[PDB]
Each structure stands twice: as C-alpha cells, then as structure tokens.
Amino acid sequence: GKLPPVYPVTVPILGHIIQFGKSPLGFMQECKRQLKSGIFTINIVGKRVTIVGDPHEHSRFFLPRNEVLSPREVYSFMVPVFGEGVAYAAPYPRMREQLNFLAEELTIAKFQNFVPAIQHEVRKFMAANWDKDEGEINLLEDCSTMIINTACQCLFGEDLRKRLDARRFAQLLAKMESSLIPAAVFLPILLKLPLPQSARCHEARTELQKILSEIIIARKEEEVNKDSSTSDLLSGLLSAVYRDGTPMSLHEVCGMIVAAMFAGQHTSSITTTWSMLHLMHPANVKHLEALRKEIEEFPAQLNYNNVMDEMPFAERCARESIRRDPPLLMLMRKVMADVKVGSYVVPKGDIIACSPLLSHHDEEAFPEPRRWDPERDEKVEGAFIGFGAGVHKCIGQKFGLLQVKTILATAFRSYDFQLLRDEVPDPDYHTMVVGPTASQCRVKYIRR
Ligand code: HEM
Ligand SMILES: CC(C)CCC[C@@H](C)[C@H]1CC[C@@]2(C=C3CC3)C3=CC[C@@H]4C(C)(C)[C@@H](O)CC[C@]4(C)[C@@H]3CC[C@]12C
C-alpha cells in the first residue's frame, strides 16, 4: 500500500525533536500545511513517528486492539512508577483487570461522598490561605495544592491523611515524576542503563509503601478493638482478587495508587487554572455571567446531583479549556501490524501518534483554534480527544471534571479574580504535562 508524506529531515541524527520541542503546535501546524495532509510522518531520533492529524480518522487511531495498536512498548518509560506487574508493566489482561478494579472505586455511587469531601477541602484552602478581601497568588500552584488535597480526601481515609499529609505526598510523587525520561520512547535503550534517576524513582516508591503497610496494620487493629471497616480507595483495592484466583499484592495496590495520582494530579489542577484564567478574563465576561447564573441557584454545600447534572456550562468551560490547551499533547501506540489510515498504509515497527494539540486545532473541526468558546462544538466527530478515546479512553474524567467543576462552583461563588497580565499565560510547553507558564499565573482574588 501507499505511505504518508515523510517530512524533510534537515538535521540527520536528531530529526525534528528540537524543532518539535520549541513550538510543538507551530512545528506541527507547519508539517500539515506543507504536505496538503493531516497524516504525516516526522522523524524523531530516527524512529518514524506517523501523526494522524485529521479528526476524520481518529477512530482509526483509538479503536484498534492492543494487538494492532499497543501502547505497552511506547509508554514503557512509565514502568518504574507503577512498579513491575502493574499496567503496561504487565500483560494486557492484567492491566485490564486492574483497570476494572480502579473503575469500580470511581463509580456513580462512590461520588455520593466525593462531593462534600471535595468541597470540604476547597473551603479549608480558601479559608487558611485566602483570608483577606484582596490578595496576590499563584493560581497554578494553588489549584495544584487544592487538587492534591481534594483528590486524597475523596480517595483516602481520615487515618491515612494524618499519616500522609497532602504536602508529603506531592513530594514523594514529584521525586518519581522527575525520574522520568519520555525521550526513552525513541531511545529505548535508555530504559536499560542504570541511570541515577531510575534508582530514586524507586527510593521514593518504597517510602509510600512503607506508609501503606504502617496504615494497613493500624486498620486491622482498629477493626478488632473497635470496628473500623473503613472504606476508601485503599480499602477497596486491598480487598480485590484476580480472576486468576490470587489476591492483589501490597506492591501492586501501592503501584496502582501512584498510576492514578500521576494521571489525576497535574492534569486536573491544570484544567482548573486554564479554565479559571479563561473565565476571570474580561473577554469572557459573558462566560463569567453564564457560569455564575448556573451556580447562582445552588445551596451552601453542593451534592452529587448539583455537580453531575446541574452544571453543564462549567463542564463546557473545562472541556474547552482542555480543548484549547490539552494537558496531554501526544497519544501514542506501537504499530504491531500494518494498519490503514486515510488512504495511506502505516507499516509495522512504525510509531503511530495522535496529537490532541494538533487535532484540537484543525480548522474544519475547530475554527478560530485559539478562541476559548465554552459554547462551541466539534464540527467533526471524535474531533475532541482531550480524554483520549476508544480502547484506552480515560476512565477518570468524571472524577477529574468532578473536582474541576467543584472548585469552580466554590471559587466563583465566593470570590472574583483578575489577571496581572493583559493576556492569558503562555502554555509552558517544556513540562511533561502541559499547563500555562507558572510565572505568568500571578492573580488577584477579590471577595464579593
Ligand atoms: C483533566 C484531567 C485528565 C486528563 C486531561 C486525562 C487525559 C487522559 C488521556 C488523554 C488518556 C489516554 C492516554 C493515552 O491514550 O495514551 C487517559 C487515560 C487514563 N486516565 Fe486520564 N486524564 C485526566 C484525569 C484522570 C484522573 C483524575 C484519573 C484517575 C484518578 C485518570 C485515569 C486514567 C486511567 C486509569 C487511564 C488509562 C486508561 C486505559 O489505558 O485503558 N485520568 N487520560
Ligand atoms: C492499570 C492502572 C492501575 C494504572 C494505569 C494508569 C496509567 C496507564 C496512566 C496514569 C498516567 C498516564 C495517564 C495520564 C494523564 C497523565 C500517563 C501519563 C504520562 C504519559 C504522558 C504524560 C507522557 C502522555 O504524553 C501520554 C500518556 C502517558 C504515556 C501515560 C498514559 C496512561 C497513564 C500512564
């Protein structure tokens, strides 16, 4: 069959890795502009990286089985985090099983107590750190602090939170996060050398696990003296059992807890800031009025129904904030067998990617790509892929957006915000999970 257009390689060894790095969006919009096609092949460090940059072919991307499009190979730099035997660090059936297990800690009945819990936290942080009529803050830093706090309140029990504060967790995670080298996807050999990083990525892991056991020991003491059949993310997973017959190990239960925190953490905190920044912006005044009238009606303490049902615009602010500036720029799969996309064939051994950033800016599907409109809809289907799609579709959106939409209803119901910048902050494209620049996120919270 035919092959997509190969993009001209100026620098032999590297490819367009440095170009890609400087202006991912720019570089990419350029690659699709100069070949009359949204299905091109850039060369990263010598590995063919075919980007499916046309929304009308997204399913082509997400629907294939792991057998045809498999992410274990491409996302293997992540293994140290999860530990061995968890997710992509384990056979697909096992990951699936573990996915099944996480999904069931986040069902609709689970959110019953999640709402007040989340709103409980956002009120402790708007009280201790926001006790003046006006003040200057770092919104990206703050949302982040609130998102890690809201997250843990929902997932972890009262006891585990004393033992493991929100501060001492953002640390343990971070220590693991920095020990990651995403470039290992194209420099695979990189995952075999003993980097000083991989060691630390594990020295931190062990410490969270030495706390889990010291917590699991106290819960079996409590139930016995005075019953504490306390249920949380940890209590639920610790009671899980594999179809194969065996229980789930402390090593794995701990591993999974990390897998979620990585996904959940920045991404949720960023989707908050972007949204808040967009909303507090004068140019979106009609989008502030729309928001405050949606929450205008609510009681002092929202419940599951208010947030899950009665906040369709807030979510539209979130979904669009992600659309305009998606925290995850590149979804990737390893091509197990030649597959078909557009009218071109994608060879085996080839690396297929589906960039949300690029697709989120297709003109046929998103006119005025840089205009933040919580009122807009995709003019091509499957066009919005902020939460991935198909086989590996995100199973935490409702929990992340649940967090995001709760802070908003809490924040804009008790404050006003301004930007110490004429314009919105620049998307700081240097980090693994992308949000706006941290320095350009100084804001002013005003009491009503
Ligand atoms: C707004 C914040 C979030 C965004 C933008 C986001 C985005 C994504 C994306 C794009 C994927 C697909 C990965 C790929 O295709 O390679 C994904 C997968 C996943 N997400 Fe999220 N996510 C968010 C929050 C969360 C949260 C809070 C959780 C759990 C607490 C979560 C759990 C997961 C899991 C378990 C997967 C893997 C599913 C699978 O491979 O079958 N996500 N997410
Ligand atoms: C089986 C259960 C117990 C645990 C599974 C959870 C994992 C599969 C999730 C948790 C974190 C996770 C999702 C994320 C939104 C961040 C993630 C983040 C880093 C990374 C990134 C940022 C380079 C991006 O570019 C592509 C997506 C990946 C490759 C990777 C995809 C799926 C995850 C690894």
Automatic annotation (TrEMBL):
GO biological process: membrane biogenesis
Positions in coiled-coil regions: none
Binding site for heme: 394
One annotated Gene Ontology cellular component of this protein: nuclear envelope
GO MF: heme binding; iron ion binding; oxidoreductase activity; sterol 14-demethylase activity
Requisite cofactors: heme
Enzyme Commission number(s) from the entry: 1.14.13.70
InterPro entries: CYP450_sterol_14alpha_dmase (IPR050529), Cyt_P450 (IPR001128), Cyt_P450_CS (IPR017972), Cyt_P450_E_grp-IV (IPR002403), Cyt_P450_sf (IPR036396)
UniProt entry keywords in alphabetical sequence: Heme, Iron, Metal-binding, Monooxygenase, Oxidoreductase
Secretion signal, residue range per the UniProt entry: none
Positions annotated to bind heme b: 75, 88, 96, 333, 392, 394
Lineage: superkingdom: Eukaryota
Keyword Acetylation attributed: no
Family: Belongs to the cytochrome P450 family.
Protein name, per record: Lanosterol 14-alpha-demethylase
Organism name: Trypanosoma brucei brucei (strain 927/4 GUTat10.1)
Lineage, uppermost ranks: Eukaryota, Discoba, Euglenozoa, Kinetoplastea, Metakinetoplastina
